[PDB]
Amino acid sequence: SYVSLSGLSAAQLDLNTTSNNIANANTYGFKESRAEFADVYSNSLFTNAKTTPGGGAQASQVAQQFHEGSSIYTNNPMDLRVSGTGFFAVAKERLTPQQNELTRNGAFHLNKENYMVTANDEFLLGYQVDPSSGEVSSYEPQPINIPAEFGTGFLTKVDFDENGSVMGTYSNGENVTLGRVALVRVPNEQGLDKKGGTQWDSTQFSGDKIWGESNKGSFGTINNGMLEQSNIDMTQELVDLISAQRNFQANSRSLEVHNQLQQNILQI
């Protein structure tokens, strides 16, 4: 019955994986998961080799498919999205920015200190560039600050170019480059371990974090006024829901058959 029970667990895992994908149809920056299964064949020295019924179906790994999702346009300059390969760098504590996590949603805003933070009041990390200099001066990531007053002049508009540089114009007509949003990439996105709130952390299987700008090297660009929806397909998740129920019914029938064999001998 363990082969039958293995099939029920494998079919139930596909239900739970699909159900979570359906549950997160509206969460920004979600990445759908896929259930992958492998065979079980166990043999010992004292077991026949020609006749080898399988041990069932073992769950191999629940993947984290990272294909790009569709973009929702909000016309909000603080809504950001990475088009291509790359992750936003977000730190929970302002003082310590080394403890950071990777996210794909760009629903940012300014707190009372005028720091660009996420919905969870976590600080977005970016590079420090001088107002007169060009590219990044020091590559260490730091929280992005948009001062209310620079000069004096009061903050009027904030916009992001394709290079991710946050530029603020003030009352005195002074355009200042306040920094650029840092973009993080990992050689294996499948290896990221999943934190809460559509956020990931780098692991041994995901390689080391690669720090870079937007539209530089293999990285993608940053577009403001946009957000990423879930990368799921509703019709496909709803059909897969159909296939996973049939495999749990077929497996439960096999479990029922094995039961009636045992009940059969108990009546001799």
Binding site: S6, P53, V257
Partner: protein, 262 residues
Amino acid sequence: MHPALWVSKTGLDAQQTNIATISNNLANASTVGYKKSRAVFEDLFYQNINQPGGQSSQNTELPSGLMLGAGSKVVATQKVHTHGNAQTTTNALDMMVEGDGFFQVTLPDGNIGYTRNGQFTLNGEGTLVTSGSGYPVEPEIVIPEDAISITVGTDGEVSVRVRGQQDNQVVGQLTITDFVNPGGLEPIGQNLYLPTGASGDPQEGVPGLDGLGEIRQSMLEASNVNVTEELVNMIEAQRVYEMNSKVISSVDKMMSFVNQQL
């Protein structure tokens, strides 16, 4: 104690082996690159009481001899190595073999295991490994960190497109292995196979040439199990199972009756 008891025991054991085979197929109804198995039955030896054709009197021989069977057993579990249906996915690292061939991966002990499962991924070092236990694919295929797109051709040539260079930069080549009798391969679990004496010598080569299949990127091979056939086989095997239990039930009632009477 009774010959019909031992024969029916062989019948019960064979049907359990058959149902265990069908239950295994139903459990792996969603496994990628899984080949269904069928149990092969054969009758056991026959006890030779009266020899058929023995010279019972001159010019006359026994047409049908008194020969009692010893039951039956499952002699083999044959793997049906027929091609499965193709699944289309947006992943660029999952490949499929269109025709004969097996992907080769590096086992932890050092040997080469053959798999039809194409769900591949990358590790931290960028080597193309399986999405299961992470066994690297032979030959090693390493994706450079500057790659923006990965494409695998029909002939298995792995190339990437780098930001700042027209034309793809080749990073490796895939070779798949075929066998004369894939049914003789040893299932070692995790959708892997190992060659045996009955399988034959492995034969490598580029995919597409000389009978080998073609590598289809962004495509997966579903299990070749037909649940309709699996469900019907379980019903039939259950009936035959109860046929032999009635003989054990009949024999037990016979032995009980003799103890009470004789």
